[PDB]
Amino acid sequence: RIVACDDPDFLTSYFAHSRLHHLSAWKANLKDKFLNENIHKYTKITDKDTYIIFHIDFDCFFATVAYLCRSSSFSACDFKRDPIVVCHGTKNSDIASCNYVARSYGIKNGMWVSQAEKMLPNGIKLISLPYTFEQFQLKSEAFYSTLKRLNIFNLILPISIDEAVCVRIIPDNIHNTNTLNARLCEEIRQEIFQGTNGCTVSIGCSDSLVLARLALKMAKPNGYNITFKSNLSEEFWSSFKLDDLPGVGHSTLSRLESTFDSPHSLNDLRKRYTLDALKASVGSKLGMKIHLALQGQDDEESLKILYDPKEVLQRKSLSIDINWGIRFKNITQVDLFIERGCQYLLEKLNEINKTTSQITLKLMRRCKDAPIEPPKYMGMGRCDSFSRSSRLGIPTNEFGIIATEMKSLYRTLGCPPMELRGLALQFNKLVDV
DNA sequence: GGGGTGTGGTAG
DNA sequence: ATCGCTACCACACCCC
Ligand SMILES: Nc1ccn([C@H]2C[C@H](O)[C@@H](COP(=O)(O)OP(=O)(O)OP(=O)(O)O)O2)c(=O)n1
Ligand SMILES: *[C@H]1c2c(cc3ccc4cccc5ccc2c3c45)[C@@H](O)[C@H](O)[C@@H]1O
Ligand SMILES: [Mg+2]
Ligand SMILES: [Mg+2]
Ligand SMILES: [Mg+2]
Ligand SMILES: [Mg+2]
């Protein structure tokens, strides 16, 4: 029934179930597809061009598709009336996606099922649907195909399985730009709904990447929003949390909330901040990025994907990360796992016709004062992260060289097998042919 | 007195 | 039970 981490089937089984594995693998495939489809198309934007960004994503993607494709066992439930989540388990299992009914009760993606169940009023039951991974891929394919078929974008950039940044180069100062672009948003939404047999998308439309992303958030669910730099207002900025900004996650949020005393929205932040205080709080680069974002402007790093997508989407490293289900008794089993992981990576490296000249082993070790078993079944729990890299010299795809050095890096780090809670094996530098 | 490594962080 | 991946950016430290 259960495949343990010392079983040869473990990696196959874990990756077959892991939604985060699928997200990353799908993204890697989409980047490759982009490169292959545009090998003769030399399209890119310059700092002289005027353009409009359409940032397009599916509403509650896994929930929508899992519902549409649900087994006969779930015939009864109603996507507009019932709170619906996609997950594996029944207690401390991540909600991959939840529908907007579930969200009306305060349920959010990434919440455990056990937290979610508490938020429902008595009587109302949470509906848990299984993942339909294959069908997520087919719906994505129909999405990307529709975007291309419309023949309206100069550039279509894959962000994720359910999300694309689509660029139209346009003349500066078009008359009736808001109406003309609204019509495009309406057409796009209709075509994708038809082309995916009933999945909805939202669209954020602007003249910068950062504003198009924010506009998309404002549009959800099942809508569009057009907010150009010239349309910015306090009311717009009042609608966004600080971590709605790209590059602001949980850690950066914590720092900003401390420095600026818990602003409730981007408008509150806009009113309190200085560039110097930002940089002191979150560092020079991120500080500048945020400052620019609060003016509706993109930083230069973010713009690289417009100016040279082929360079940006090129793969520069290859790794696996397993930080769930890792429970080893001894070093013999750790070594066998490292060997299997190295072969998995070599099969991928060989499939993309590359070699590697540098590797890294990263591990998660149980914190001294953390419980031996965490609350989440097979979770890593609270850990310290340690890593060591090695240059191999000449670029290679030889198992003997790579795997031997990986096992050696494990020994240098000195983690007792019973304290190990996660492992990452990385090929950091790749060379073609 | 500039750069390589380990560490921390972000996005779906 | 439950499936906490993975590419890529940033930067503090520490070298002699
Ligand atoms: N930590 C994450 C992030 C995303 N996903 C998966 C499930 C989501 O359905 C899909 C797309 O991610 P989004 O962040 O776009 O979330 P949704 O599409 O579910 O909702 P929204 O309507 O907010 O876009 O990726 C996941 O499993 N775990
Ligand atoms: C697991 C992990 C870590 C950090 C965080 C921080 C904030 C979180 C909020 C909500 C859910 C959640 C789940 C897993 C998390 C979270 C959060 C890291 O410290 C750890 O290494 C893992 O990524
Ligand atoms: Mg989204
Ligand atoms: Mg989505
Ligand atoms: Mg998305
Ligand atoms: Mg954010």
Determination technique for this entry: X-ray
Residues A210, A155: Cα–Cα separation, whole Å: 17
Domain ranges of chain A: 8-46, 47-60+133-227, 61-132, 228-316, 317-433
Q: Thinking of the domain A228-316, which architecture would CATH place it in?
A: Orthogonal Bundle (1.10)
Q: Do domains A8-46 and A228-316 have the same CATH topology?
A: no
Residues A344, A389: Cα–Cα separation, whole Å: 19
A257 touches strand B (CB under 7 A): no
A374 touches strand C (CB under 7 A): yes
Residues A205, A212: Cα–Cα separation, whole Å: 5
A375: cis peptide before it, omega within 30°?
no
- Rg value, chain A, Cα: 24
Q: How far is CA A237 from CA A52, A203, A215, in A?
A: 20, 18, 10
Q: How far is CA A259 from CA A75, A267, A293, in A?
A: 51, 15, 18
Q: Thinking of the domain A8-46, which architecture would CATH place it in?
A: Helix non-globular (6.10)
- Residue A139, token pair as written in the block: 């719906």
SS (H, E, C) chain A: CCCCCCCCCHHHHHHHHCHHHHHHHHHHHHHHHHHHHCCCCCCCCCCCCEEEEEEEEECCHHHHHHHHCCCHHHCCCCCCCCCEEECCCCCCCECCEECHHHHHCCCCCCCEHHHHHHHCCCCCCCEEECCCHHHHHHHHHHHHHHHHHCCCCCEEEEEECCEEEEEEEECCCCCCHHHHHHHHHHHHHHHHHHHCCCCCEEEEEECCHHHHHHHHHHHCCCCEEECCHHHCCHHHHCCCCHHHCCCCCHHHHHHHHHHCCCCCCHHHHHHHCCHHHHHHHHCHHHHHHHHHHCCCCCCHHHHHHHHCHHHHCCCCCEEEEECECCCCCCHHHHHHHHHHHHHHHHHHHHHCCEEEEEEEEEEEEECCCCCCCCCCCCECCCEEEEEEEEEEEEEECCHHHHHHHHHHHHHHHCCCHHHEEEEEEEEEEEEEC
- Say which amino acid occupies A2: I
Homologous superfamily of A317-433 in CATH?
DNA polymerase, Y-family, little finger domain (3.30.1490.100)
Residues A69, A12: Cα–Cα separation, whole Å: 24
The CATH classification number of A47-60+133-227 equals 3.30.70.270
Residues A116, A93: Cα–Cα separation, whole Å: 10
Residues A427, A305: Cα–Cα separation, whole Å: 24
Q: A181 exposed, middle or buried (CB, 10 Å; 0-12, 13-18, 19+)?
A: buried
Axis-axis angle for helices A133-149, A61-68 (nearest 10)? 110
Nearest to A303 by CA among A39, A47, A52: A47
- Residue A277, token pair as written in the block: 């205080």
Q: Cα–Cα–Cα angle for A87, A20, A35, nearest 5°?
A: 135
Q: Ligand 2: which residue has its CA nearest to atom 19?
A: A382
Residues A244, A214: Cα–Cα separation, whole Å: 7
Return left, alpha or beta for A156; rule: phi > 0 is left, psi -120 to 50 is alpha, else beta. Answer: beta
The CATH classification number of A61-132 equals 3.40.1170.60
A258 touches strand B (CB under 7 A): no
Q: List protein-proximal bases of chain C (any atom < 7 A from a CB).
A: 1-12
Q: List protein-proximal bases of chain B (any atom < 7 A from a CB).
A: 5-12
User: Is ligand 1 within 6 A of the CB of residue A162?
Assistant: yes
The answer to whether the beta carbons of residues A226 and A185 sit under 8 Å apart is yes
- Residue A255, token pair as written in the block: 């720092």
